């Protein structure tokens, strides 16, 4: 979608793998503000908004907190306190058709600097003076929605850069977007340390004959000591016994 109407999709209830994002080399710009790029896979957020558009390459730097410019002031403005990241990747071959693509257009003029995460579609003629426009384009009245101009042979700064700004919102509601939990292979008959889905413990993990109910995840004994657990993968019950200790 053109930058004058940036396409915003919300995402929730999904396990997001941001590792593939920065591990991929297609993206030219991966400036992430607020959150460390490596730690993105280890944070849980209530929801994530993906606002996508196409921009001129030379204006790609404008998409960030604290910068002014036509795209920043009149098309899409990020907050001063932004906790997210900005994917920006050149798409010269896809978006620059032969003869110049004119479908993508941007808002050059607007009476007031729009608030962060505001979208203005209204194709209303700008006053630009004291003249009553009355909906006709005059010397002072004109349409503030101009197409970029996308000839296939252009300067590299004028090429299409497709930009998606991932904005993470963490409300009071439970977080639904998280990174991959990851896993390790299981070792049975060794005094080890284990973290079964947040269950932190030590000991030897035998294969057990316990018949858990399907919903149950782990089992305690009398005096409430954890002595059994299903590994989340393969859904099989294990039996925990403490590492050998005694007096000498």
């Amino acid at each position, epitope marked *: 979608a053109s930058v004058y109407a940036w396409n915003r999709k919300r995402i929730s209830n999904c396990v997001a793998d941001y590792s593939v994002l920065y591990n991929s080399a297609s993206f030219s710009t991966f400036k992430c503000y607020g959150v460390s790029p490596t730690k993105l896979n280890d944070l849980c957020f209530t929801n994530v908004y993906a606002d996508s558009f196409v921009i001129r390459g030379d204006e790609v730097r404008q998409i960030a907190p604290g910068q002014t410019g036509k795209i920043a002031d009149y098309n899409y403005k990020l907050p001063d306190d932004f906790t997210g990241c900005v994917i920006a990747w050149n798409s010269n071959n896809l978006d620059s058709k032969v003869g110049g693509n004119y479908n993508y257009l941007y808002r050059l*003029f607007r009476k007031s600097n729009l608030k962060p995460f505001e979208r203005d579609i209204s194709t209303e003629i700008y006053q630009a*003076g004291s003249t009553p426009c*009355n*909906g006709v384009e005059g*010397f002072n009245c004109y349409f503030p929605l*101009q197409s970029y101009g996308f000839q296939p042979t252009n300067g590299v700064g004028y090429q299409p850069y497709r930009v998606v700004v991932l904005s993470f919102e963490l409300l009071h509601a439970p977080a639904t977007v998280c990174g991959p939990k990851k896993s390790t292979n299981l070792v049975k008959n060794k005094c080890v340390n284990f973290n079964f889905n947040g269950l932190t413990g030590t000991g030897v993990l035998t294969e057990s004959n316990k018949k858990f109910l399907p919903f149950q995840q782990f089992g305690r004994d009398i005096a409430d000591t954890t002595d059994a657990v299903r590994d989340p993968q393969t859904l099989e019950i294990l039996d925990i016994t403490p590492c050998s200790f005694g007096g000498v």
Partner: antibody
Amino acid sequence: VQLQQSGPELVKPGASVKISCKASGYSFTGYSMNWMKQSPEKSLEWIGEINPSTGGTTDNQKFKAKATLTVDKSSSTAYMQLKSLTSEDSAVYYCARSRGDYWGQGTSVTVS
Amino acid sequence: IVLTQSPASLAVSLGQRATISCRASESVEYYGTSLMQWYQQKPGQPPKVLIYAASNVESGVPARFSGSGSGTDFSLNIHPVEEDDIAMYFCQQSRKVPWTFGGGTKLEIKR
């Protein structure tokens, strides 16, 4: 989307002529229909502005004397009628879209 | 507002960087927007428009055309000059009710 301007004139001094412009492929509703005067040597200048949506007439004060601007919704045309004619007011008259991205071919009104 | 165009005529070699200047009688910028428009007119041709305002350019005008300025001072920039860019270039203003054009800036291939 073109623009056409009709009529070469030779009318005697003191009269009035309504130069007509056919809008052709315009939308003729959201685009001001501007009137311009190119003096034969070089001098261009703005006659007046008409809002085809309503019919508002914003005209230059010095030429507000007897120049009037009319919009015709039926033919979507512009009629510029400059009452009273004199030798010096013999210049090319043009009609343009908005600021002038599309002009007419032009008429040579020659008070003779 | 009455504008003054300098120079009256200016010579270019094909592909030489070109600049033409206009001076305004009063301030043109109000509310952060300047409102002058400059035109090119080949002989026997309807004069077109190159700029919506102070600096920006209309669609259909080649990107080689540019311009900028503030207040009274304004100037174009025709960096690649070809045989087509041989004409007179006017400069408008839009502030006072009488909208006034300028004089004449003839572009000539230098020799």
